[PDB]
Write a protein that holds these residues in place. Structure first.
Motif, mmCIF file in Angstrom:
data_model
loop_
_atom_site.group_PDB
_atom_site.id
_atom_site.type_symbol
_atom_site.label_atom_id
_atom_site.label_comp_id
_atom_site.label_asym_id
_atom_site.label_seq_id
_atom_site.Cartn_x
_atom_site.Cartn_y
_atom_site.Cartn_z
ATOM 1 N N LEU A 8 14.025 73.719 18.851
ATOM 2 C CA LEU A 8 14.801 73.912 17.606
ATOM 3 C C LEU A 8 15.959 74.909 17.790
ATOM 4 N N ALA A 9 15.745 76.040 18.450
ATOM 5 C CA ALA A 9 16.841 76.992 18.689
ATOM 6 C C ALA A 9 18.045 76.292 19.272
ATOM 7 N N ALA A 10 17.768 75.444 20.263
ATOM 8 C CA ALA A 10 18.802 74.759 21.000
ATOM 9 C C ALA A 10 19.509 73.744 20.117
ATOM 10 N N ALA A 11 18.767 73.014 19.284
ATOM 11 C CA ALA A 11 19.394 72.006 18.413
ATOM 12 C C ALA A 11 20.189 72.764 17.371
ATOM 13 N N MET A 12 19.631 73.845 16.839
ATOM 14 C CA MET A 12 20.353 74.593 15.821
ATOM 15 C C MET A 12 21.658 75.138 16.392
ATOM 16 N N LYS A 13 21.603 75.620 17.630
ATOM 17 C CA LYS A 13 22.807 76.085 18.331
ATOM 18 C C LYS A 13 23.906 75.047 18.582
ATOM 19 N N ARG A 14 23.540 73.857 19.070
ATOM 20 C CA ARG A 14 24.550 72.807 19.337
ATOM 21 C C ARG A 14 25.232 72.337 18.068
ATOM 22 N N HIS A 15 24.544 72.481 16.932
ATOM 23 C CA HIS A 15 25.094 72.114 15.630
ATOM 24 C C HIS A 15 25.886 73.228 14.941
ATOM 25 N N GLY A 16 25.992 74.389 15.569
ATOM 26 C CA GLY A 16 26.905 75.431 15.068
ATOM 27 C C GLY A 16 26.311 76.494 14.132
ATOM 28 N N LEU A 17 24.987 76.677 14.164
ATOM 29 C CA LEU A 17 24.326 77.657 13.271
ATOM 30 C C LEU A 17 24.307 79.108 13.799
ATOM 31 N N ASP A 87 16.262 63.907 13.654
ATOM 32 C CA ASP A 87 17.643 64.361 13.887
ATOM 33 C C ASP A 87 18.092 65.295 12.747
ATOM 34 N N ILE A 88 18.385 66.563 13.083
ATOM 35 C CA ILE A 88 18.548 67.653 12.081
ATOM 36 C C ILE A 88 19.964 67.869 11.575
ATOM 37 N N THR A 89 20.810 66.884 11.823
ATOM 38 C CA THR A 89 22.206 67.013 11.558
ATOM 39 C C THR A 89 22.448 67.165 10.084
ATOM 40 N N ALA A 90 21.801 66.341 9.256
ATOM 41 C CA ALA A 90 21.974 66.444 7.836
ATOM 42 C C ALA A 90 21.428 67.766 7.307
ATOM 43 N N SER A 91 20.270 68.206 7.801
ATOM 44 C CA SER A 91 19.662 69.479 7.345
ATOM 45 C C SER A 91 20.599 70.680 7.690
ATOM 46 N N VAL A 92 21.144 70.639 8.904
ATOM 47 C CA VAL A 92 22.061 71.680 9.387
ATOM 48 C C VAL A 92 23.355 71.736 8.650
ATOM 49 N N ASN A 93 24.021 70.610 8.416
ATOM 50 C CA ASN A 93 25.297 70.679 7.668
ATOM 51 C C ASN A 93 25.105 71.009 6.186
ATOM 52 N N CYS A 94 23.990 70.566 5.627
ATOM 53 C CA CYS A 94 23.649 71.000 4.281
ATOM 54 C C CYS A 94 23.349 72.525 4.166
ATOM 55 N N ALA A 95 22.589 73.063 5.131
ATOM 56 C CA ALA A 95 22.384 74.491 5.268
ATOM 57 C C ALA A 95 23.715 75.251 5.370
ATOM 58 N N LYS A 96 24.720 74.706 6.038
ATOM 59 C CA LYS A 96 26.016 75.362 6.050
ATOM 60 C C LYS A 96 26.642 75.500 4.675
#
Length: 129
Positions: A8-17, A87-96
């Protein structure tokens, strides 16, 4: 999908968190742990009748549409089921959007009560990032 912590750290990182709005990666991982236990499929109903969805427990009251939360918004313009994908892309961009809302990571009750003020770095210790 149940993520491993460093996974998760790594996925969160590649998505810009990492350092997004000044929150280091360990904040996002600690939040994810105490919201979902790193489980993408996690769902929890709130007392107000809204439901929280996903890795970051994003709610149907303000952020996503679940067909069943009266008088709610969908400020992320997505079905809430999209927040349950492996795939956490939607969760990550919504968190932004959420974290940009003025209250920062205080939006996340678990973050405020279990992460804030703590040594969050520990949550990515030993990860290859």
């Amino acid at each position: 999908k149940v993520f491993g912590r460093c996974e998760l750290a790594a996925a969160m990182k590649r998505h810009g968190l990492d350092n997004y709005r000044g929150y280091s990666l360990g904040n996002w991982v600690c939040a994810a742990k105490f919201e979902s236990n790193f489980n993408t499929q996690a769902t929890n109903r709130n007392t107000d009748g809204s439901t929280d969805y996903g890795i970051l427990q994003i709610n149907s009251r303000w952020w996503c549409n679940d067909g069943r939360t009266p008088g709610s918004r969908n400020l992320c313009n997505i079905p809430c089921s999209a927040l349950l994908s492996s795939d956490i892309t939607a969760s990550v961009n919504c968190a932004k959007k959420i974290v940009s809302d003025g209250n920062g990571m205080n939006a996340w009750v678990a973050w405020r009560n279990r992460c804030k003020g703590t040594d969050v770095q520990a949550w990515i210790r030993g990860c290859r990032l």
